[PDB]
Design a protein around this ligand. Structure first.
Ligand SMILES: *C[C@H](CCN1CCOCC1)C(=O)NC[C@@H](NC(=O)[C@H](Cc1nc2ccc(C(C)C)cc2s1)NC(=O)CC)C1CCCCC1
Length: 357
C-alpha cells in the first residue's frame, strides 16, 4: 500500500471530527467523512470503530487514527474511479495534484455526481485547464460550496496546492496577531480581547457568544489554535472583515427555534468551568440575562428566586428545561402543571412567584 497532501486538502474542505457523529443521511461517521456502519445502533458503530482502530476508542480517536481511516477511503475512492468508464480516462491522464482535486470531487458528490460533469472532464483530459476552470465555475457545485469549489477549481487550473497553501498563510498571519506570547499554540486573554476589538464587539456581548457557538468553542476565556483555524475555514472566512459580514446570517439562524435551542444548550457547556458538571449560579444568571433576554417574562423574578432560595450550581438538565418552561408558561402561571415532570427547582419557583402574581 505504501507504494501508491490529500489528507490536509480534505481536512480543510470537509473537516475533521474526532468524535462519532451522525451525518446528513443519519449515518454514524468519524474522521473526514468516514462511514462506520449503515446500522442505527451506536453499539454497532463503536464496535466497527473499535475493530478498525484496534482499541476501545469509546467513539473518540486521535488525528493519526483519523488519517489511517482516511487513507483507506482514498484507496477505495481511487479503486471506484478506476472501475468507472467515465472517470478512469480523465484520472489516468492527470498529474498527482489534479488527481487529488478529482478524488476531492468524488468525496463530495460521489462517482455519479462527478461523471455528470462530462464537458469539464473532457476539457481536463485534453489539458485545457483555463476552459475547464471557467466551465466548472458555472455549476451548482460552485454556488453550494463556493469556498471549497474555488479551491478545487484553482487546483485544476494551476496544478499546484496554491489555493490551500495561500489560505493557510493568510490564517497563520491573522493568528499571529492573537496568539499568546507565553503560549504560541493558544490565543490568551489579551488575544481574545484583541480579536473582539478588531470585530468592534465587547467580549461579554451576545454577538461574541453567537461567534463562539459558530466556532464550536469549548470554554469561555479560552481559544485554541485548532478552534481558530477550523472555525475560520468552516465559516469560509480568511479575515476579520469576512467574519464580521457573517454575523447578521448567524443572527437570522437563531430566529428558527431548532437553531436557538442548539445555541441555548451550547451556552451551558461553553460557560461552565472545565472539570465541573454544573454551572455556578452567578455565571448561570449572567448567561441567562444574555440568551433569555426578551424570551422569558419571569427572568428577573427567576434570578431573584435563585439568589435568595437556591444559592447553588445549576445542573445541565435544569438549564435545558428552563427554555421549555419560558416558552409554555402563561403570564399568570395558571397553565403550570405542578403535578407534572418539571425539575423541583422550577416547581419551587412557581410556588414562590404565584403569590407575587
Ligand atoms: C475568563 C474570565 C475570568 C474571570 N474574570 C472575572 C474576575 O476574576 C478574574 C477575571 C471570565 O470568566 N469572565 C466572565 C465573562 N466572560 C467573558 O467575557 C467571555 C470571554 C470570551 N471567551 C471567548 C472564547 C472564545 C472566543 C472565540 C470564539 C472568538 C471568544 C471569547 S470572548 N465572553 C463570553 O462568554 C461571551 C458572552 C462574562 C461575560 C458575560 C456573561 C458572564 C461571563
Amino acid at each position: 500500500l505504501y507504494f501508491q497532501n490529500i489528507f490536509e486538502m480534505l481536512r480543510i474542505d470537509e473537516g475533521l471530527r474526532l468524535k462519532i457523529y451522525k451525518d446528513t443521511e443519519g449515518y454514524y461517521t468519524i474522521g473526514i467523512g468516514h462511514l462506520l456502519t449503515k446500522s442505527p445502533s451506536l453499539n454497532a458503530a463503536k464496535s466497527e470503530l473499535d475493530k478498525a482502530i484496534g482499541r476501545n476508542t469509546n467513539g473518540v480517536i486521535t488525528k493519526d487514527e483519523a488519517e489511517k481511516l482516511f487513507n483507506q477511503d482514498v484507496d477505495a475512492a481511487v479503486r471506484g474511479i478506476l472501475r468507472n468508464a467515465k472517470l478512469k480516462p480523465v484520472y489516468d491522464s492527470l498529474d498527482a495534484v489534479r488527481r487529488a482535486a478529482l478524488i476531492n470531487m468524488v468525496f463530495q458528490m460521489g462517482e455519479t455526481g462527478v461523471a455528470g460533469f462530462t464537458n469539464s472532464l473532457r476539457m481536463l483530459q485534453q489539458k485545457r485547464w483555463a476552459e475547464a476552470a471557467v466551465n466548472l465555475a458555472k455549476s451548482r457545485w460552485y454556488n453550494q460550496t463556493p469556498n471549497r469549489t474555488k479551491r478545487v477549481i484553482t487546483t485544476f487550473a494551476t496544478g499546484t496546492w496554491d489555493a490551500y497553501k495561500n489560505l493557510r498563510k493568510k490564517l497563520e498571519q491573522l493568528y499571529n496577531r492573537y496568539k499568546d506570547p507565553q503560549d504560541e499554540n493558544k490565543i490568551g486573554i489579551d488575544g481574545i480581547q484583541q480579536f473582539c476589538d478588531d470585530l468592534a464587539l465587547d467580549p461579554a456581548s451576545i454577538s461574541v457568544l453567537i461567534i463562539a457557538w459558530k466556532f464550536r468553542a469549548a470554554t469561555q476565556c479560552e481559544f485554541s489554535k485548532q478552534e481558530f483555524m477550523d472555525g475560520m475555514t468552516e465559516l469560509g472566512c480568511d479575515s476579520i472583515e469576512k467574519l464580521k459580514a457573517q454575523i447578521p446570517k448567524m443572527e437570522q439562524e437563531l430566529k428558527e427555534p431548532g437553531r436557538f435551542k442548539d445555541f441555548y444548550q451550547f451556552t451551558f457547556n461553553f460557560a461552565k468551568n472545565p472539570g465541573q458538571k454544573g454551572l455556578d449560579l452567578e455565571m448561570a444568571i449572567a448567561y441567562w440575562n444574555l440568551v433569555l433576554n426578551g424570551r422569558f417574562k419571569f427572568l428577573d423574578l427567576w434570578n431573584k428566586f435563585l439568589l435568595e432560595h437556591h444559592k447553588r450550581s445549576i445542573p445541565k438538565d435544569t438549564w435545558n428545561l428552563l427554555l421549555d418552561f419560558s416558552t409554555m408558561i402563561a403570564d399568570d402561571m395558571s397553565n403550570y402543571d405542578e403535578e407534572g415532570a418539571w425539575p423541583v427547582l422550577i416547581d419551587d419557583f412557581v410556588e414562590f412567584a404565584r403569590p407575587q402574581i
